[PDB]
């Protein structure tokens, strides 16, 4: 019945760097998805209470959203591009896990995923 704390977006005990590929993950890949007309279900952690989804955090143990990812990128939380890519993949998988195959949210999620993949193919 309660929401869990959201994912960490910051940590001073993790070293930091900026790379061309992380810049690209922020200003190309996240930018494209974030501005898409289907982004809104994914722009923030799922609020199980407010949305009355009591099964959500029984089912989803590794939550992730674009709000967290954007924050992570802005906070230099990732060292490697694949860390970030993994978070996107987790966001999309969770959607498929929790929602029914016929649900409009799944079709929103797959539309965003195709775009995501098309962008990752042009990583620098």
């Amino acid at each position: 019945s309660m929401n869990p704390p959201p994912p960490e977006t910051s940590n001073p005990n993790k070293p930091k760097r900026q790379t061309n590929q992380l810049q690209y993950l922020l200003r190309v890949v996240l930018k494209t998805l974030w501005k898409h007309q289907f982004a809104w279900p994914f722009q923030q952690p799922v609020d199980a209470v407010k949305l009355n989804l009591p099964d959500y955090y029984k089912i989803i143990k590794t939550p992730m959203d674009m709000g967290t990812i954007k924050k992570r990128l802005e906070n230099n939380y990732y060292w490697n591009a694949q860390e970030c890519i993994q978070d996107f993949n987790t966001m999309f998988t969770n959607c498929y896990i929790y929602n029914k195959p016929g649900d409009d949210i799944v079709l929103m999620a797959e539309a965003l995923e195709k775009l995501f993949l098309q962008k990752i193919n042009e990583l620098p």
Binding site: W40, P41, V46, D47, L51, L53, N99, D103, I105, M108
Partner: peptide, 10 residues
Amino acid sequence: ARKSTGGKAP
């Protein structure tokens, strides 16, 4: 779908 339901069904 609906803003109120986070785009989730039922």
